């Protein structure tokens, strides 16, 4: 359950 995924948000 994720409304927003990122491969990379670092």
Cβ atoms within 10 Å, residue 7: 5
First to last CA, the chain: 20
Experimental method: NMR
For every residue of 1-10, DSSP letters joined together read --SS--S---
SS3 content of the chain, % helix, strand, coil (to 5): 0, 0, 100
Q: List the structure tokens of 3.
A: 């409304």
What is the distance between the alpha carbons of residues 10 and 1, in angstroms, rounded to a whole number?
Answer: 20
Q: List the structure tokens of 5.
A: 């995924």
Q: List the structure tokens of 9.
A: 């948000």
């Amino acid at each position: 359950d994720r409304v927003y995924i990122h491969p990379f948000h670092l």
